[PDB]
């Protein structure tokens, strides 16, 4: 019943670490239509229109240390500008554990996401955008990891834990551990007046 597709795009100005985030998210998401590079705002709807994308992850970097994810629904959806502060990529050696490449995750959430309609919208968009469809073409059956989402100090801390089994269950943390500071929410996709500000 749920049928979705993500577009993973980049901007010129993305460094080493941020490139590894597009690598590892394209790994974890089986419905990730990975795209190389974009140069410029309005074009991204049309890219999504070509590949039949239900979602568009636009990773921007203005100053080369920064990262700004522009999560969106293409045709008329409310796009969300983030600023991602902390970063620990997939290829950091302290993390131990193999998730299946693009298996169905389990989305974990928080109480304070239902506190406002504001955090309710990002909660929903993280469910179907950062999540998975039940029958994605590159998706692996037996469920093997989670997506831990939790808010503290007005920012959502994202982690991906591989579940560990013994013969009841453990779970060792891996993958992109990062905060998401909700900067801005537009009314339409990359156009129209701004709904939310900080």
């Amino acid at each position: 019943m749920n049928k979705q597709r993500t577009l993973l795009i980049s901007s010129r100005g993305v460094n080493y670490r941020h490139r590894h985030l597009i690598q590892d998210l394209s790994g974890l998401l089986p419905h990730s239509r990975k795209e190389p590079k974009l140069d410029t705002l309005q074009q991204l709807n049309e890219i999504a229109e070509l590949y039949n994308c239900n979602n568009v992850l636009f990773f921007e970097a203005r100053k080369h240390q920064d990262l700004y994810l522009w999560l969106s629904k293409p045709p008329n959806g409310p796009t969300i500008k983030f600023y991602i502060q902390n970063l620990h990529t997939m290829d950091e050696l302290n993390f131990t554990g193999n998730c299946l490449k693009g298996s169905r995750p389990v989305l974990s959430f928080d109480q304070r996401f239902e506190s406002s309609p504001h955090y309710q919208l990002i909660k929903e968009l993280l469910v179907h955008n950062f999540g998975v469809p039940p029958n994605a073409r590159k998706s692996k059956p037996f469920i093997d990891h989670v997506m831990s989402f939790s808010i503290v100090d007005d920012k959502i801390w994202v982690r991906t834990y591989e579940i560990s089994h013994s013969t009841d269950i453990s779970l060792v943390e891996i993958g992109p551990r990062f905060v998401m500071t909700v900067i801005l929410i537009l009314e339409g996709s990359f156009g129209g007046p701004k709904i939310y500000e900080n």
Binding site: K101, N135, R137, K138, S139, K140, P141, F142
Partner: protein, 101 residues
């Protein structure tokens, strides 16, 4: 895909009676138990679309269709890939039709 095992080597499953698992978890069984005669025949007079690699769906050798083999040859001798087109269309003068004042 319907075999759902990625860029892993098919060295694994050579000792199994199945090639991997698929969406909604069930056993993709290896399709046939061929004769030793047929296997020796396919190492002397190799199959039509023989490609030397192993299929992901089944342990059997991945062959090619007649149409694909035709398409590879038509790339290498250049021979017009997309048919139902004329190589020599009449120059339809879409701009000189209307005289300038």
């Amino acid at each position: 895909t319907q075999n759902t095992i990625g860029n892993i080597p098919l060295s694994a499953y050579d000792e199994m009676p199945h090639i991997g698992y698929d969406i909604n978890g069930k056993r993709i069984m290896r399709p046939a138990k061929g004769s030793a005669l047929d296997q020796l025949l396919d190492s002397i007079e190799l199959p039509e679309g023989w490609t030397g690699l192993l299929d992901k769906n089944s342990g059997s050798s991945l062959n090619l269709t007649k149409e694909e083999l035709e398409l590879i040859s038509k790339i290498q001798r250049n021979e017009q890939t997309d048919d139902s087109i004329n190589p020599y269309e009449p120059l339809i003068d879409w701009f000189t039709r209307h005289e300038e004042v």
